[PDB]
């Protein structure tokens, strides 16, 4: 029809947005023509999504942006950056977020790598560390990336949830990040706001509000909570008994299983009782699948083969 299919989809989206925001109705608001400091938060969050797309969970998350602090030489502030040929140190002031530490869900460190056409080596592996207090180890590895030093400028992003989570609970442990060259030759990648000083380095903190703070459809949940709604169902295939097959030597069978049950359009799980993906016509289907190994013969020669998407491990309404 493409008639009801589109309208049922629009209407599911209406309830999905309000549900994810924990709103019972749209909030009756100004209609201005908005501070650019507010648009920058939205612009960075959108852009980060577009970058990660160049490859709790349900409820909406509020996003806060924390820029690299500005340095005033007349003030008594310690500079936010320090420099060695092999690494860079960058520290964010996240003190205004300490009252929200329990609501943190994810934190991203976003820094713009500048093009360095004078770079000697064209590729470098760079590592992100969380600096620790000391005696003891002085840094904790977070992540690493290979970068093209001479390539056109690009945004990089790191998951730094663990480090920021610690900084919000213990201000005394905020010694900043270290962006270091991977050494098993100087650091040849350059970064906006760090080297040579829109492209300011910043943190994106995703928070679940307390008022929103107030079970996957897998074997652990479904097999212990039998229900008519969409859920995993057990099914064992015996190759000889059920298929009449005797050419597979191992395994004699496996629990392929399947997904079955009701998916509503509008010990309980929300993935079973609401329409989380806002489908126009929700259907109970597999979410996570796993491969299967088999050993069979075609005469004298043994064959060990791996077959993808053979075992159903979880379900979803879609």
């Amino acid at each position, epitope marked *: 029809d493409m008639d009801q299919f589109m309208r049922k989809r629009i209407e599911a989206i209406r309830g999905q947005i309000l549900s994810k925001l924990k709103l019972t109705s749209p909030p009756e608001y100004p209609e201005p023509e908005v501070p650019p400091e507010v648009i920058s938060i939205y612009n960075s969050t959108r852009d980060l999504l577009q970058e990660k797309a160049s490859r709790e969970e349900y409820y909406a998350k509020e996003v806060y942006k924390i820029d690299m602090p500005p*340095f005033f*030489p*007349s003030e*008594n*502030a*310690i*500079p936010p*950056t*320090f*420099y*060695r040929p092999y*690494f860079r*140190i960058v*520290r964010f*002031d996240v003190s205004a977020m300490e009252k929200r530490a329990s609501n943190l869900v994810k934190a991203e460190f976003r820094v713009f790598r500048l093009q360095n056409p004078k770079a000697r080596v064209p590729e470098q592996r760079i590592e992100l560390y969380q*600096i620790l*207090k*000391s005696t003891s180890p*002085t840094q904790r590895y977070i992540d690493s990336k290979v970068v093209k030093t001479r390539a056109e400028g690009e945004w990089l992003s790191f998951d730094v949830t663990d480090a920021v989570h610690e900084w919000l609970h213990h201000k*005394d442990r*905020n*010694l900043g990040f*270290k962006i270091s060259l991977h050494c098993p030759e100087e650091l040849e990648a350059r970064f906006a706001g760090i080297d040579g000083t829109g492209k300011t380095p910043h943190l994106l903190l995703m928070l679940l509000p307390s008022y929103r703070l107030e079970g996957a459809l897998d074997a652990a949940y479904c097999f212990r909570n039998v229900q008519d709604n969409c859920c995993l169902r057990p099914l064992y295939i015996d190759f000889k008994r059920d298929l009449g097959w005797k050419w597979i030597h191992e395994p004699k069978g496996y629990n392929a299983n399947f997904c079955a049950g009701a998916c509503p359009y509008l010990v309980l799980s929300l993935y079973n009782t609401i329409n989380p993906e806002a489908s126009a016509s929700p259907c109970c289907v597999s979410q996570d699948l796993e491969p299967l190994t088999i050993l069979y013969y075609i005469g004298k020669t043994p064959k060990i083969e791996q077959l993808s998407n053979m075992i159903v491990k979880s379900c979803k309404c879609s």
Partner: nanobody, 116 residues
Framework: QVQLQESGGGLVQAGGSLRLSCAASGYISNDDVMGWYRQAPGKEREFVAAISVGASTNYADSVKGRFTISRDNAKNTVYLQMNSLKPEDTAVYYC???????????WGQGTQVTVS
């Protein structure tokens, strides 16, 4: 707790060198940032240089290529090597230490530097 004593200042001719040193009396952590500010008479404190984790440094634009900050963690001493001295560098130079917060909280009484 924390006490800072500067020395090495004096009157030099432009183009000459001078080495400042700041001895830290009390307890300072190697993680704690140390640095130098300078205050011309009447004018306000001005960041010059600071040293941090992994002997990492940060320099004011006016002293880049001429000043070197270094640190002897074993004796809790920071040095400021001043080469190619200019009249613009004439000020009282204060050494500073990080207070337990990301700001300079401890200050020595300062040493004069005059460049002819």
């Amino acid at each position: 707790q924390v006490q800072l004593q500067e020395s090495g200042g004096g009157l030099v001719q432009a183009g000459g060198s001078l080495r400042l040193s700041c001895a830290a009396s009390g307890y300072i952590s190697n993680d704690d940032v140390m640095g130098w500010y300078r205050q011309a008479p009447g004018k306000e404190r001005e960041f010059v240089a600071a040293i941090s984790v992994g002997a990492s440094t940060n320099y004011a634009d006016s002293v880049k290529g001429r000043f070197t900050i270094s640190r002897d963690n074993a004796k809790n001493t920071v040095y400021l090597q001043m080469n190619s001295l200019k009249p613009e560098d004439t000020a009282v130079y204060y050494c500073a230490a990080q207070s337990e917060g990301y700001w300079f909280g401890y200050w020595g009484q300062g040493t004069q530097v005059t460049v002819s």
